[PDB]
Each structure stands twice: as structure tokens, then as C-alpha cells.
């Protein structure tokens, strides 16, 4: 299958494709994004092997294991660290220990990356994570071997704040989720917004509510109260920090309740969410903006995708992604390029470690701590972007504020601004189609002597 290719140097891969008995990941609903990213990693490895300039004569293999969002993030790691006989020795020094994989392209959610890195830190095995944006992953003493090809929530919050300042909104509502992601994102946004003269009218927590399930009446009353507080408030810009799964029920009340006239700002969880934009009924709720990664077109990847031990197989992924092929094709490559550049950074680090140039390499034995040492210093041009790591293990890939325009014949998420993490400044802002009567920029102020705690209000 596609979850394994023999090679000289193996490369672990963890992709989110979905007490006595343990429910396997294959029984959960198939997530298309994970399969797309897995195919991106495989295409990157195949293109590296195709090319005779980078790692010449060296085969780059991989071992891709289906990981879950939370459920299974242990065995995959134990399997990567073990030898070919599925046996991992216990010893104080691992400087001369050779694992099955030399690096892993780690999972996509923050908790899974933390769990994998807490066990990969004992071996200093490199781990480049895509699509994980926790500010806590920037701690290089807690996670010595953890790297990243995406900006953290630092730059996402910065992009949100600059978008607020450009259009002169100093009166915003923050809606977070009950999980640690929403709480951390809301706290970071609040602490940043408190020093740029933008006040938060209030903050509320949405209940944890996975879709396709029967929800209780207490959650319904909580949603009623939250939407009533939104409607009563004079702030007309709402920032939502919640997973892409838990917002279906909440937007239905905003609509059932018929609350109109707000600018919604979306975190990267649900900004480019294709199934959530599939709803096609939120159009009357105002304008939808979202922070995500800039599209980087990978030449030959769309055609490659269209042409195509345990927790290592899925069957409904192809039939699920067939129906999403055209919208994924039009939306471009956002996290795909993150996986691509992670694989290419690992390959360039391996090339530098082996010390070969346009000829057969030395084929020496490689310890993962050596590759981790060499991979911090990679600096190469990939698809007209400079790929190098910050002293905190981050790649400054441009972000993008994207606007939800309902049109299947065009890009479903039209780019309207570009964020540059290196200068922390948002520029190249384009026309935005506003929900107002005459396409005038919506106003979010509490005040045309101070009143209340907020400085913005008088």
C-alpha cells in the first residue's frame, strides 16, 4: 500500500486520517485533510527520489502510520523508535542507538504533538509538525527535538489584531471552546488586544458538541444564552476560537435566532474548513474572514493526488476525497506545502549531514540526534520560499486573511490580505465584499468621562 516504501533512510509519518476494548481509528469518520497531507508527504519523498541533485544515490523511505486526533499517539512512536524486530532497548545513553526512522513528520494537533514529543525527547529524534499552532511548542527545553513548518498562534493572533486595527474595530466579542485550544487562543488574543487599545466586550465558552450526535437541553440553553448575549451586545465583530467540528450547532442558533450584521473572524481551525463552508447558509450572517496559511501551488501535486502493522490503513478516504476534489483543487495548498517543506527540510539536512554533492553519497550510519543537530541550520529555497528555522523551531511562512465567498466556479476562500511573520505586519489588503448596504466598512465601536472597565468605552 501507500503507507510504506522501503528505502535507505526511513521517515516516520503521523497523519490524522479520522476501556477494555480499544476502538481503532479506522472506525471513525474519515477526514480528507489527513489523507491529502499524507499524499503530500509521499509526493515530496517521491520527488526527492526522482531528483538526482538532492540526496543522489540515496533512497528516501518512509513508514506512515494513521494517527488519531487524541486516541492513539503512543504505539506509532514506540514502533518508530523500536528496531526492525519491534524491540526497543532501555538504556541511559542513546547517542549510539539507531532507530527505525531517522525523523518523523509529526501529527497535526497540539496535544498529539506534545504527547509524541514527550517520548521523542529521550532520543532527540527530529519531529517537524505541520498545522500545530500552540505557543507552548516553542519551548525548546521542554521539546528539544520539535520543529515546525507553520507559524504559531502568536502570528495568527497578530494577524487578527492587525486586521482589527486596519478597519478600526476596538470593540470585539471573543467566543472560545471548552478545550485547551480555545482557552489558550482566547487568553493569548485577550492579552495581546489589551495593549493595542482594542477592548473585548465579553468572552463566552461554547459547549463541547461534536456533530452527528444528540445533544442535551442544557447545551441548547447555553447556546440560547450565548446568542442572546451576542444579539444584545453593541459589538459587531466576533472572533471564534473553536475546533472545526463543534461550530455546526452554534451557527444554527445564530441563524435560527436570526442574528444578522456581524463580521465573523475565524481561527485556522475552521477558516479554510471545506465541510463547514459547505453549509452555504451562513451567507446572511454577515462577512466571514479567517486566518490561515498562504496558498503555495506545488506543481504536479494536484495531478498526483487525482491519479491516486496497526492503525495503518483506511478505505473510505478515496471515496470521501473524490467528492471534495474540486474544492480542494481550487483552494490550493496550505498545509500540503507545510508537509512538503517538512519533508524537504529533513532531506536537505540529511544531504548536508552525509556531505555529498551531485554524486554518490557516503551512506554512513546516522543517529537521529545528529540529524536534529544538522536540521536547525537548513536554509534553502523551495518553490520561491526561503525555508529555514527560527531559534525557536518555527518557519516564517506567510499567513493570509481569507474571505468566504460562495461560488463553486472560483476559489471558495478568496484571499484578501497577506501576513508576513518576519515583520509582523499585515499588508497588501484587497477589496472585501461587506454585508453592509453600500459595501461600507462595518463599524465596531462602543463609543462615538469613562464608563465601565473598558478604556474604549466612554
Amino acid at each position: 500500500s501507500d503507507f510504506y516504501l522501503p528505502g535507505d533512510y526511513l521517515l516516520g509519518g503521523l497523519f490524522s486520517l479520522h476501556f477494555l476494548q480499544v476502538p481503532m481509528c479506522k472506525e471513525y469518520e474519515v477526514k480528507v485533510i489527513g489523507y491529502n497531507l499524507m499524499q503530500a508527504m509521499r509526493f515530496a519523498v517521491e520527488e526527492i527520489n526522482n531528483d538526482s541533485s538532492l540526496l543522489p544515490g540515496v533512497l528516501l523511505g518512509y513508514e506512515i502510520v494513521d494517527v488519531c486526533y487524541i486516541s492513539n499517539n503512543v504505539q506509532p512512536v514506540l514502533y518508530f523508535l523500536a528496531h526492525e524486530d519491534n524491540l526497543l532497548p532501555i538504556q541511559e545513553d542513546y547517542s549510539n542507538y539507531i532507530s527505525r526512522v531517522v525523523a518523523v513528520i509529526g501529527p497535526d494537533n497540539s496535544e498529539s504533538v506534545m504527547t509524541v514529543a514527550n517520548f521523542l525527547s529521550l532520543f532527540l529524534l527530529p519531529q517537524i509538525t505541520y498545522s500545530a499552532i500552540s505557543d507552548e511548542l516553542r519551548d525548546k527545553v521542554r521539546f528539544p527535538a520539535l520543529l515546525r513548518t507553520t507559524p504559531s498562534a502568536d502570528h495568527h493572533i497578530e494577524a487578527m489584531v492587525q486586521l482589527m486595527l486596519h478597519f478600526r474595530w476596538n470593540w470585539i466579542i471573543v467566543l472560545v471552546s471548552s478545550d485547551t485550544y480555545g482557552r489558550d487562543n482566547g487568553q493569548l488574543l485577550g492579552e495581546r488586544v489589551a495593549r493595542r487599545d482594542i477592548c473585548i466586550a465579553f468572552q463566552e465558552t461554547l459547549p463541547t458538541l461534536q456533530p452527528n450526535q444528540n445533544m442535551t437541553s442544557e447545551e441548547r440553553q447555553r447556546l440560547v444564552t450565548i446568542v442572546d448575549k451576542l444579539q444584545q451586545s453593541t459589538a459587531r465583530v466576533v472572533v471564534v476560537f473553536s475546533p472545526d467540528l463543534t461550530l455546526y450547532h452554534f451557527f444554527n442558533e445564530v441563524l435560527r435566532q436570526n442574528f444578522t450584521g456581524a463580521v465573523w473572524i475565524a481561527s485556522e481551525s475552521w477558516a479554510i474548513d471545506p465541510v463547514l463552508h459547505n453549509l452555504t447558509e451562513l451567507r446572511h450572517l454577515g462577512t466571514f474572514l479567517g486566518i490561515t496559511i498562504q496558498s503555495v501551488p506545488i506543481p504536479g501535486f494536484s495531478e498526483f493526488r487525482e491519479w491516486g502493522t496497526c492503525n495503518q490503513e483506511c478505505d473510505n478516504c478515496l471515496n470521501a476525497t473524490l467528492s471534495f476534489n474540486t474544492i480542494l483543487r481550487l483552494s490550493g495548498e496550505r498545509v500540503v506545502y507545510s508537509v512538503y517543506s517538512a519533508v524537504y527540510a529533513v532531506a536537505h539536512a540529511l544531504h548536508s549531514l552525509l556531505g555529498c554533492d551531485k554524486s554518490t553519497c557516503t551512506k554512513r550510519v546516522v543517529y537521529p540526534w545528529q540529524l536534529l543537530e544538522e536540521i536547525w541550520k537548513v536554509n534553502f529555497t523551495l518553490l520561491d520560499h526561503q525555508i529555514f528555522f527560527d531559534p525557536q523551531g518555527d518557519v516564517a511562512l506567510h499567513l493570509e486573511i481569507v474571505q468566504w465567498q460562495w461560488d463553486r466556479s472560483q476559489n471558495p476562500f478568496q484571499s484578501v490580505a497577506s501576513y508576513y511573520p518576519l515583520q509582523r505586519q499585515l499588508k497588501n489588503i484587497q477589496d472585501i465584499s461587506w454585508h453592509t448596504i453600500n459595501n461600507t466598512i462595518p463599524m465596531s465601536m462602543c463609543s462615538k468621562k469613562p464608563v465601565g472597565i473598558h478604556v474604549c468605552c466612554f
Partner: protein, 465 residues
């Protein structure tokens, strides 16, 4: 002293131990902690005393010996991961296999008496849950460890932070304080406490005027936002150092007296109680755990330290190299520690679960193949185990249940002391006629908002009519 040599003894079923025995990279080398920690050694000795006195018992685990493997885990998780990986290795072998699930493993320890730290408990419990190894922890209190989705085999003999935060919310609701400010330490403990208290207050009709995080040693901004609201009651769910920093700043700033609701971290710590000038910063009310203590533990430590010096005993008889070069003075400071009962109760809970699993009886116990660690989990939930004559039970969430005592700082000659002014057992009961307040006279401070008649609050609950 041949003390570290006694961190291991063989038995029919060997227990595991993760204690903070010591305190504090380019190569993958496990760091070594040379500094000595007295609490870790005291808790290890508490576990040792529990195991030995269980072995002495006839009606509990009859005809079988109980061992242990006490392992030094510093506050770092990278040093604690190695003992766990050794715990899950096959007995007599130095390798851990990569099987597809727990049923194929044969761990060398029946259970693990987990780490004291809550973050370390999170890491090791996430690791152990794959193998379904029962791990009961002492002193790990943060609530998210109670999720059976991600911790199917994590137990604890200390109450979670949810119990004390529910008690605090009940105290606020009973006293009429529905307009309060909630603060928490910037670490994970304070953030989780704040997140739990938000939901508790929203359910109980309390609205939070301000919800800030106090940094560990900014604070001026946090105290300014607290003062901006007309809040008379502040809930400070912070650690000892963050609370001490906030209180030092507010003492230096001559901040007005307030009712402080105290977490168990700083309610009793003498670092903040003895801070000069604290008598002018309002009443401190907190909920302190109502638990038993090991009456014969200090005697056990002193006799064991005395007996460890005999060359004959050691000759008849490393994990903690710094544990050998110590004296009784280095450990007698923390002899009367509450967590010793938690360690002792965790060991007794594992012993009772094992005794139930083997279906042993008083006269003897049936002979069968050794049980895997996952066989304990069925008998660890819904389990009643008696510790020191007082019954204890494990919840469906692996949480133990104990009452709480509402305490206040009464000042007499610059010497604050705790007094009983309430009791929480799932429902709060207080005696407010014996609570001495900080106000001009003995009137309860008023911290109220109107829910019905301008919206106000962090969650937009109250109105300024």
C-alpha cells in the same frame, strides 16, 4: 547509610514508584539529579512503610509478598520517562516491545504509584494508558486527569481541583458574593482552575468581573483591573510563588483589604502567612483538605534511619546516590507531611484491588496464573479500601472522595492561625457567626451585582442599573 539499597525488594507482585527523590542537551542522555529532595524520600518511605505493614498483615494479601521499585523522577518528564519504560518492560528483560495493543505485554510491575506532579502525572498517565497499567497517584490534583477517554487507568488518592473549586463557588453563592474577580497563576494549575471556576460560576449565578493570570516571579495591570471593578471578593487560585508575588506587590502598593478565596497551594504555606503587613489586606478564606495523618510515620522514619546505620543489616541486605549521605536532621523537617497518608493510601488501594482480583480470603488465597496489570482495572473502579480504619472509595472517574474544611486566617499579635468556620462534603455548611471579618465592624463584605433592573462583567452577566 545503605538507604538507597532499600528502594527495591523482590516479591510475588512488584509495585512501581515515581517519587521526586532528587532535583536538578545535545546528546540523547538522560539527565541525572544529584540534589536531594526531602519530600521525595519521605513519600518513598511512606510507600515502603505501607508495603511492609501490608506484608505483615495476614488477612490482606495472604501468603504473598509485595515488592516495590522506587524510582527517582525529578520534576522533569524526560527523567521520569525512563523508569516508566523500565516498568513496562518484560520481567527479566531490558527491552520493551512494540505490540499493537496492551494485551500482548507482560509488565514487570503490577501497578505504579504515580508521580506527585500533575504535569508528570499527565505525561506518565498518557504513556501508561496504552498498556492499561493501573497508576494511582498522590498529590496530582488537576481535573483533566479525570478524563477516562484519555486516562483509562489513572487513579488518585487526593481530591481533584474541581472539588475545592466547587466548594469555593458554593461559598460564594451562599454568602451572596455574585460579583467577584477570579485570578489564577500563569502556569497550567492556575489556568485550569480558572477554566473550571468559569463554568462553575456561570452555573451558580456568579459573574466574574475580571479574569486574569498572575505571572510567576503584568501584576500591576492585573491588580489595576481587579481594582477597576467594585469587587470586594477575589478568588486567587494560584501557586505559592505567584500568590506571594501578588501579595507582596499589593502590600507594597497599599491595596485595599479584600476577601481572598485561597486555593490549597497558599492557604497554609508559611511563606505567605508570615509576609509582613498581610493583616491589613483583608480576610483570607480557603478550603483545606480534611484527611488523616500517619500517626506512626515519624517513628518509622527515625527507627529506619537508625537501623540503616548498622553494618550488619546492610551487609545482610544506584537509584538515589545522594540518599546515602544524609542524616535524620535533613529529613525531620517534613516528617508530619499530609501527602504521606496519600502515598500510604495509594499503596493500600492497590493492595486491596490485587487482593480482590485474586479472590483471596482470610485463611488463604487461591493459586492461579499471575494477573496482568490490566486485570486490576476492573477491581480498582468501584473499589472500597480501608486506610487506617477509615473507608475510602474510587469513583467511576478514578477520583477519591474526602471532605473539606473551611478555614480563615485569624490574626492575634501578628500570628495568623487557621480556625474551622465551615465544612464541605458535597454540600457546604458554614458558621458565619464565628467568622471575624476585616471590615470596620463585623459585617460581611458586600460584593454584589444586579442581574435584573448597562451590561457588565467578563461574560456579560450583570447590569449596572
Amino acid at each position: 547509610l545503605c538507604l538507597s539499597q532499600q528502594l527495591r525488594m523482590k516479591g510475588d507482585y512488584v509495585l512501581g514508584g515515581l517519587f521526586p527523590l532528587g532535583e536538578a542537551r545535545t546528546r540523547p542522555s538522560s539527565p541525572v539529579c544529584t540534589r536531594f529532595s526531602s519530600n521525595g524520600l519521605l513519600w518513598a518511605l511512606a510507600m515502603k512503610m505501607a508495603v511492609e505493614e501490608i506484608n505483615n498483615k495476614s488477612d490482606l494479601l495472604p501468603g504473598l509478598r509485595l515488592g516495590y521499585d522506587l524510582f527517582d523522577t525529578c520534576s522533569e518528564p524526560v527523567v521520569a520517562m525512563k523508569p516508566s519504560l523500565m516498568f513496562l518492560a518484560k520481567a527479566g528483560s531490558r527491552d520493551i516491545a512494540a505490540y499493537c495493543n496492551y494485551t500482548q505485554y507482560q509488565p514487570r510491575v503490577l501497578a505504579v504509584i504515580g508521580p506527585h506532579s500533575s504535569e508528570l502525572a499527565m505525561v506518565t498517565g498518557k504513556f501508561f494508558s496504552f498498556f492499561l497499567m493501573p497508576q494511582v497517584s498522590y498529590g496530582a490534583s488537576m481535573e483533566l486527569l479525570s478524563a477516562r477517554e484519555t486516562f483509562p487507568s489513572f487513579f488518585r488518592t487526593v481530591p481533584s481541583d474541581r472539588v475545592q473549586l466547587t466548594a469555593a463557588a458554593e461559598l460564594l453563592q451562599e454568602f451572596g458574593w455574585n460579583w467577584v474577580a477570579a485570578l489564577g497563576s500563569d502556569d497550567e494549575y492556575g489556568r485550569q482552575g480558572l477554566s473550571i471556576f468559569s463554568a462553575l460560576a456561570a452555573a451558580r449565578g456568579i459573574c466574574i468581573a475580571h479574569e486574569g493570570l498572575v505571572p510567576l516571579p503584568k501584576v500591576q495591570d492585573v491588580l489595576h483591573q481587579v481594582n477597576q471593578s467594585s469587587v470586594q471578593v477575589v478568588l486567587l487560585f494560584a501557586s505559592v510563588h505567584a500568590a506571594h508575588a501578588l501579595f507582596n506587590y499589593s502590600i507594597s502598593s497599599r491595596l485595599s483589604p479584600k476577601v481572598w478565596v485561597a486555593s490549597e497551594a497558599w492557604l497554609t504555606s508559611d511563606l505567605v502567612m508570615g509576609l509582613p503587613g498581610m493583616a491589613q489586606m483583608g480576610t483570607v478564606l480557603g478550603f483545606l483538605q480534611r484527611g488523616a495523618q500517619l500517626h506512626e510515620f515519624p517513628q518509622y522514619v527515625k527507627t529506619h534511619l537508625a537501623l540503616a546505620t548498622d553494618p550488619a543489616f546492610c551487609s545482610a541486605l544506584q537509584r538515589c546516590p545522594q540518599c546515602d549521605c544524609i542524616t535524620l536532621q535533613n529529613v525531620s523537617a517534613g516528617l508530619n507531611h499530609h501527602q504521606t497518608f496519600s502515598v500510604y493510601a495509594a499503596v493500600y488501594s492497590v493492595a486491596q484491588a490485587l487482593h480482590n482480583t485474586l479472590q483471596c480470603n482470610a485463611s488463604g488465597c487461591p493459586a492461579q496464573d499471575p494477573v496482568k496489570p490490566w486485570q486490576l482495572l476492573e477491581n480498582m473502579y468501584n473499589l472500597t479500601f480501608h486506610v487506617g480504619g477509615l473507608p475510602l472509595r474510587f469513583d467511576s472517574s478514578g477520583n477519591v472522595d474526602m471532605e473539606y474544611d473551611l478555614k480563615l486566617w485569624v490574626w492575634q499579635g501578628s500570628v495568623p492561625r487557621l480556625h474551622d468556620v465551615g465544612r464541605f462534603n458535597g454540600s457546604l455548611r458554614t458558621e458565619r457567626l464565628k467568622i471575624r471579618w476585616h471590615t470596620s465592624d463585623n459585617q460581611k463584605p458586600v460584593s454584589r451585582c444586579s442581574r435584573q433592573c448597562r451590561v457588565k462583567g467578563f461574560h456579560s452577566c450583570c447590569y449596572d442599573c
